[PDB]
């Protein structure tokens, strides 16, 4: 492992210090369908004409990014994405910008969001949740080794590929930091107590989110929910957590330590680092090397009738992509 990480850091650093830029143009892609929409951007399925490949293109409106004060976060996302490489991270193929928008073309994962699959089936068995959770463990080990904090873990940001393995996406909040950071960001149900209490936090928040993820995958609902964010935040800091009857004794033990309101003893943030997680009873049967190599039998293989298929994705209102004849926020995004 230490051997693997060492070399991984070498490649990341070279890219991190000399980020690729303007590697394509909008007119080289064919717009196919909208796969998701947010407050400042959208993701569309596109077809690259030269190669005949299908990709997921994330389009961000520079003006809306500025209004929402996400300029630095957007620069963080692209600079980090063009520099990483791990089997469980969706690959960024190209990036560019024009007068109005920022563009990030990633590899398309036709399988769809874990979210959609999880909700339809209710809950995943423990071996099933363990298989996915293990992939997040190694992904976080990787990211963290590079001083990167993810901060956006949730079923909505995990895609399932043709081999049945997970592909993490949405690096909108990813940041390279040594020491503490303070930005209030994330998703209610997944926020660590440190974040809600606004008191400087570190990568420990990612491990906490893993705790929430495993619980939701195995229960069918998150450990902390309510119709109002305030109500949700009260439950998270309370230091109280209830576990379904079917949860194994080990799983409940793995979660007590992960969803530890005292981040100075929360698994992942201890002297043993991630090993307190990897060597835990609930993972006793996991062959970590097997997971990274993808030689483990997937619990479920999504289906598709062909490349370009989008049935594993919801339908979204198709809006037009406009590009003003005037540059909009040049300086703010010069390094993109």
């Amino acid at each position: 492992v230490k051997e693997f990480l060492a070399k991984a850091k070498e490649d990341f650093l070279k890219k991190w210090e000399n980020p690729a830029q303007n590697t394509a143009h909008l007119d080289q892609f064919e717009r196919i369908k909208t796969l998701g929409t947010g407050s400042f951007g959208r993701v569309m399925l596109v077809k690259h004409m030269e190669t005949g490949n299908h990709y997921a293109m994330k389009i961000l409106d520079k003006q809306k990014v500025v209004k929402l004060k996400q300029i630095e976060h957007t620069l963080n996302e692209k600079r980090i994405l063009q520099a990483v490489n791990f089997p469980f991270l969706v690959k960024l193929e190209f990036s560019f910008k024009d007068n109005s928008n920022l563009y990030m073309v990633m590899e398309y994962v036709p399988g769809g969001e874990m979210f959609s699959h999880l909700r339809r089936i209710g809950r995943f068995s423990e071996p099933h949740a363990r298989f996915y959770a293990a992939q997040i463990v190694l992904t976080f080990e990787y990211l963290h080794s590079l001083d990167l904090i993810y901060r956006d873990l949730k079923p909505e940001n995990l895609l399932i590929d043709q081999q049945g393995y997970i592909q993490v996406t949405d690096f909108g909040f990813a940041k390279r930091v040594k020491g503490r950071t303070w930005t209030l960001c994330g998703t209610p149900e997944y926020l660590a107590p440190e974040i809600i209490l606004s008191k400087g936090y570190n990568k420990a928040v990612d491990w906490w989110a893993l705790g929430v993820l495993i619980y939701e995958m195995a229960a069918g609902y998150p450990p902390f929910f309510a119709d109002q964010p305030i109500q949700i935040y009260e439950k998270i800091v309370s230091g109280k957590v209830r576990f379904p009857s079917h949860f194994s004794s080990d799983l409940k033990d793995l979660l007590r330590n992960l969803l530890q309101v005292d981040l100075t003893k929360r698994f992942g943030n201890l002297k043993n680092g991630v090993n307190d997680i990897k060597n835990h009873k609930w993972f006793a049967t996991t062959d970590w090397i097997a997971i990274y190599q993808r030689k483990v039998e997937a619990p479920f293989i999504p289906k598709f009738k062909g490349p370009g298929d989008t049935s594993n994705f919801d339908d979204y209102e198709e809006e037009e992509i406009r590009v003003s004849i005037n540059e909009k926020c040049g300086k703010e995004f010069s390094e993109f």
Partner: peptide
């Protein structure tokens, strides 16, 4: 059941991120 309360809540759809 907690499962029922969850499905009946307004938090079963895609959950948006926060910051502001």
């Amino acid at each position: 059941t907690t499962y029922a309360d969850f499905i009946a809540s307004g938090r079963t759809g895609r959950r948006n991120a926060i910051h502001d």
